[PDB]
Design an enzyme around this catalytic site. Structure first.
Site, PDB file in Angstrom:
ATOM      1  N   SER C  98       0.828  -1.202   0.000  1.00  0.00           N
ATOM      2  CA  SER C  98       0.000   0.000   0.000  1.00  0.00           C
ATOM      3  C   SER C  98       0.863   1.253   0.000  1.00  0.00           C
ATOM      4  O   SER C  98       0.720   2.120  -0.869  1.00  0.00           O
ATOM      5  CB  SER C  98      -0.939   0.001   1.209  1.00  0.00           C
ATOM      6  OG  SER C  98      -0.212   0.105   2.419  1.00  0.00           O
ATOM      7  N   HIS C 215      -8.452   2.310   1.184  1.00  0.00           N
ATOM      8  CA  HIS C 215      -8.725   1.739  -0.134  1.00  0.00           C
ATOM      9  C   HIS C 215     -10.213   1.746  -0.470  1.00  0.00           C
ATOM     10  O   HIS C 215     -10.719   0.801  -1.080  1.00  0.00           O
ATOM     11  CB  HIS C 215      -8.180   0.314  -0.243  1.00  0.00           C
ATOM     12  CG  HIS C 215      -6.732   0.199   0.105  1.00  0.00           C
ATOM     13  ND1 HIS C 215      -5.761   0.980  -0.482  1.00  0.00           N
ATOM     14  CD2 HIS C 215      -6.088  -0.607   0.982  1.00  0.00           C
ATOM     15  CE1 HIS C 215      -4.582   0.663   0.022  1.00  0.00           C
ATOM     16  NE2 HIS C 215      -4.754  -0.296   0.912  1.00  0.00           N
TER      17      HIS C 215
END
Ligand SMILES: Nc1ncnc2c1ncn2[C@@H]1O[C@H](COP(=O)(O)OP(=O)(O)OP(=O)(O)O)[C@@H](O)[C@H]1O
Ligand SMILES: Nc1nc2c(ncn2[C@@H]2O[C@H](COP(=O)(O)OP(=O)(O)O)[C@@H](O)[C@H]2O)c(=O)[nH]1
Ligand SMILES: [Mg+2]
EC number: 2.3.1.39
Lengths: 206, 68, 326, 352
Positions: C98, C215
């Protein structure tokens, strides 16, 4: 098949040949003479004239085998036998004087009796006649139930719920449970005998 | 290189140094034997190692170390 | 040409891999002290002391964990280069989870330390603000073959509509390995999923210790800040094949990284697709070496779940201790 | 009980006790052998509720050698060798039990192969930055060494000031047990604590304070190869391990007042073929040069007397449950299948 129809299966029984000619019956004398003319297949790797040979345990080992790895299957079988033996010895050392006479320490006897305690004599045969499947009771042959006991034991020992418990340890526990008429395999036999009694009115379809 | 050369020379060898040190220590605490010892060592080092050679080496070492 | 087995793929961890003592075993190695000095210069506080000795609560904060993971990942890259020059020389692919994405680009020569760290800082701050804006969270769900994920998200949204809130959010946020995903959204939806796991056929459910639902569209307010910080930065062409998270394919042209790094903020992480794109091959053919440059070993377990054979050649760089004092 | 001997004192066994099993008491089991016995013999001890060892020619010869040993001469190296599963480990155990009963100081290494493979906490020594420590392997051995030789730990005293760290040091004249304790309490100094013990035991035995036995099983590991790696995935040599480096000094015959007994082992060995059992093949050139000169002792399969006595012992423990086992045909079949190999016979009898 690479054997011609003339070839016959061999008889590995060692004490059969030592039978005195006096004991031989006329039919047995005739068949002994007849086998002289016949061609005999090569004995397969497996059965032997050994006094320790056990066809039931050999069949169990063959049924556990995966991908032809017979060494691993026999290793698992002998480990299970040793585990059962050691558990029974441990239970025998810790038992009372009168309780030691009813404790079996022979792993082969325990294995045979545990498998015999799980044999179903009646089963079902799916039969769709009127457009709907109908399960009818049918008497099981001896070979069928001998196979079913082994298959149920192995399938019960292959359940994924037993996480990281090695196959010998699981199999010894299940064998010792079935030796005492306990465990899920005996229950699977009972639930088949009950579900075949619940449909005794469907035997007329046979 | 000694590896390329097909001979273990017992002279100026670790076996000789060790046995010399051991015998000096034994004398402080207090030959055909050394000949047979070096023969056995050379055999075990150059020829094939079998139990017969191992037993010959055992006997030579026992005679050198006064073990019966 | 090179054969698979002397090449190497470097995997960069993401948020959730922070640990107290992170950094020890890398300081004495070359060039790491200078990197932490630069971290102090850019950030405004001593990242080194927090990473080494921290309460773990200040470290689990979003504003502090991500820069720490970034600097630790690059320090581990330096350590690996010191120990094994050939591995760094023979590098074919790079991928980050990420925030480790920002590390991989910086490792691939598409960015320099200062700009990447500034981007990570603004990203962490904006994400913290976005998480503060609305209650939310992330829930790891391990399903079984009969599990329906979009379906369960649908009832999880029906529950929150019945309670009554503007456009409930509950969708898959991370595809990690088969039948395991990370759902993201309002805590009510995650609690509904946890309490109805049996109906939804979820074998395991574990709430992540994260600030908010990353996300997802809930993180939209954090998009505009990061974009501005990325606008000044000149992103070059990556030297090695750096894989993306939005669509799980190699970055092709440098002018598209600018918007993909912002779409990654509000898009699901396509980790399983990336693992396939990097390691997919016919049976029997060799796999490359795999090195997890950074804290933790989570990517190792994920790779084990994804590809056993690719996992056979996996190793992790120790960022907590060093065998030899260089 | 033709397979048993009433003489449970190892100092009085001779050729007339060959093939007969003598009993080791539970006290002797827990004291002399916390770690020595083979893993599959401990199962037999637990199942039979008794530890019994057969008296065999290798052990008898090695006991006759140790009874007539001159303690003024340098220590003699004895190396037990033989094919796989021939009983050399249990012969070494028999000799260790003999030596323990005569108030010898026992330095018993149950398996030296464990120190050169599968080590997860490998450290770098503060004493010597070029060597590595194995705290888990050193502290595990220290506890059992303390168990075996608890009596002497207070009689034996150091002759130097050992500095564990700036705060903690062991002063001259303190009992050796303190050193052991410092290795058992703080694992960081466990490996350093082992070497000191060896350094003391090799020295004091020379003075004549006590008789020392160095029993190293799987001695071939010391001069071979390791499967331990650095962080750069480079190989590590055995001499780079402090635990292995200090144990090589004990194998050299530069000290007197004791005996060095060792047993080879291909089981667990690294980079050796399955059928290699001879001294040179397992030791290597370096190992042979290190041990040379030494007395090799051969351990073989059961002779008919020993085989019959072992089967009678198993029958007396009711351990053969098959109905055909006690018969003669079953005995011939077992003899052929094992070829009188003790380990194969034990494994075959385990599941019958
Ligand atoms: N003296 C003995 N008394 C009783 N059992 C014995 C004896 N010697 C050997 N055995 C049997 O043989 C088995 C193997 O013996 P042991 O462990 O000593 O073999 P080894 O030759 O040292 O083996 P390896 O080559 O694998 O190291 C023992 O577990 C025991 O079953
Ligand atoms: N912590 C500590 N360990 C010591 C000390 N002295 C000896 N040792 C350990 O005990 C072992 C004794 O072996 P030694 O005779 O000194 O051989 P050396 O290592 O080559 O010098 C050494 O290998 C050390 O590991 C000491 O003063 N402090
Ligand atoms: Mg052994």
């Amino acid at each position: 098949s690479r054997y011609s129809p003339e070839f016959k299966d061999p008889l590995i029984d060692k004490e059969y040949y030592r039978k005195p000619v006096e004991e031989l019956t006329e039919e047995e004398k005739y068949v002994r003479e007849l086998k002289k003319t016949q061609l005999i297949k090569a004995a397969p790797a497996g059965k032997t004239s050994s006094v320790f040979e056990d066809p039931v345990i050999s069949k169990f080992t063959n049924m556990m085998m995966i991908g032809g790895n017979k060494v691993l299957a026999r290793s698992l079988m002998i480990q299970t036998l040793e585990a059962v033996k050691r558990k029974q010895f441990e239970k025998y050392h810790a038992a009372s004087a009168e309780e030691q006479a009813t404790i079996e320490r022979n792993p082969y006897t325990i294995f045979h009796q545990a498998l015999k305690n799980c044999e179903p004599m009646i089963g079902l045969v799916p039969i769709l006649k009127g457009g709907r499947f109908y399960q009818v009771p049918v008497p099981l042959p001896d070979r069928r139930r001998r196979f079913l006991a082994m298959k149920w034991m192995i399938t019960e020992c292959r359940d994924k719920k037993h996480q990281r418990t090695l196959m010998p340890e699981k199999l010894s526990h299940k064998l010792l449970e079935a030796f005492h008429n306990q465990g899920p395999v005996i229950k699977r036999k009972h639930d088949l005998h009950k579900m075949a009694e619940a449909n005794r009115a469907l035997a007329h379809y046979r | 290189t000694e590896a390329d050369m097909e001979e273990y020379i017992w002279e100026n060898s670790s076996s000789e140094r060790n046995i010399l040190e051991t015998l000096l220590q034994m004398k402080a605490a207090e030959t055909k034997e050394i000949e047979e010892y070096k023969k056995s060592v050379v055999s075990l080092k150059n020829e094939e190692e079998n139990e017969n050679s191992i037993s010959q080496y055992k006997e030579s070492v026992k005679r050198l170390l006064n073990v019966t | 040409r090179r054969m698979p087995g002397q090449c190497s793929v470097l995997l960069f961890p993401g948020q959730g891999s922070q640990v107290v003592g992170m950094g020890r075993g890398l300081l004495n190695y070359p060039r790491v002290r200078e990197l932490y000095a630069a971290a102090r210069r850019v950030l405004g506080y001593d990242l080194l002391e927090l990473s080494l000795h921290g309460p773990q609560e200040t470290l689990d904060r979003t504003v502090h964990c991500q820069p720490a993971i970034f600097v630790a990942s690059l320090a581990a890259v330096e350590k690996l280069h010191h120990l094994q020059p050939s591995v760094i020389e023979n590098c074919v692919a790079a991928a980050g989870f990420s925030v480790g994405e920002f590390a991989a680009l910086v490792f691939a020569g598409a960015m320099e330390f200062a700009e990447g760290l500034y981007a990570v800082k603004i990203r962490a701050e904006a994400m913290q603000e976005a998480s503060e804006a609305v209650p939310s969270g992330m829930l790891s769900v391990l399903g079984q073959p009969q599990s329906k994920f979009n379906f369960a998200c649908l009832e999880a949204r029906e529950h929150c509509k019945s309670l009554g809130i503007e456009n409930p959010v509950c969708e898959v946020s991370n595809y990690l390995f088969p039948d395991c995903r990370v759902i993201s959204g309002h805590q009510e939806a995650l609690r509904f999923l946890q309490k109805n796991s049996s109906k939804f056929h979820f074998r395991r459910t574990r709430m992540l210790p994260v600030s908010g639902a990353f996300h997802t569209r809930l993180m939209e307010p954090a998009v505009e800040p990061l974009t501005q910080a990325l606008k000044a930065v000149d992103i070059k062409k990556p030297l090695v094949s750096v894989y993306s998270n939005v669509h799980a394919h190699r970055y092709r042209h440098p002018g598209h990284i600018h918007k993909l790094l912002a779409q990654q903020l509000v898009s699901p992480v396509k980790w399983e697709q990336t693992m396939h794109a990097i390691y997919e091959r016919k049976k029997g053919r060799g796999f490359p070496q795999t090195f997890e440059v950074g804290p933790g070993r989570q990517l190792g377990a994920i790779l084990k779940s994804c590809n056993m054979q690719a996992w056979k050649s996996y190793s992790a760089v120790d960022v907590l201790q060093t065998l030899e004092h260089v | 009980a033709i397979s048993r001997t009433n003489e449970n004192d190892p100092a009085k066994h001779g050729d007339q006790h060959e093939g007969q099993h003598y009993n080791i008491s539970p006290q002797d089991l827990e004291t002399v052998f916390p770690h020595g016995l083979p893993p599959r013999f401990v199962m037999q001890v637990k199942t039979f509720s008794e530890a019994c060892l057969m008296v065999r020619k290798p052990a008898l010869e090695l006991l006759h050698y140790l009874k007539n040993t001159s303690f003024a001469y340098p220590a003699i190296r004895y190396l037990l060798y033989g094919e796989k599963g021939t009983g050399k480990t249990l012969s070494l155990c028999h000799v260790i039990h003999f030596c323990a009963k005569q108030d010898w100081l026992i330095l018993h290494i149950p398996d030296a192969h464990l120190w050169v493979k599968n080590c997860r906490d490998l450290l770098q020594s503060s004493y010597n930055k070029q060597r590595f420590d194995q705290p888990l392997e050193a502290s595990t051995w220290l506890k059992n060494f303390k168990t075996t030789n608890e009596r002497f730990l207070n009689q034996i005293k150091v002759q130097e000031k050992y500095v564990w760290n700036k705060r903690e040091s062991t002063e001259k004249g303190s009992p050796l047990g303190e050193v052991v304790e410092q290795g058992i309490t703080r694992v960081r100094n466990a490996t350093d604590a082992v070497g000191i013990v060896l350094k003391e035991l090799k020295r004091q035995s020379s003075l004549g304070m006590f008789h020392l036995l160095v029993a190293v099983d799987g001695i071939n590991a010391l001069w071979g190869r390791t499967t331990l790696k650095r962080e750069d995935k480079s190989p590590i040599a055995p001499e780079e391990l402090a635990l292995v480096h200090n144990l090589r000094k004990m194998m050299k015959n530069d000290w007197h007042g004791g005996a060095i007994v060792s047993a080879l082992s291909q089981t667990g060995s690294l980079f050796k073929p399955r059928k290699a059992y001879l001294p040179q093949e397992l030791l290597g050139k370096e190992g042979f040069d290190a041990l040379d000169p030494f007395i090799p002792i051969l351990v073989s399969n059961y002779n008919p007397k020993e085989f019959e006595s072992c089967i009678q012992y198993y029958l007396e423990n009711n351990w053969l449950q098959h109905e055909k086992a006690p018969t003669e045909e079953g005995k011939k079949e077992l003899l052929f299948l094992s070829n009188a190999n003790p380990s194969l016979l034990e494994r075959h009898c385990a599941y019958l």
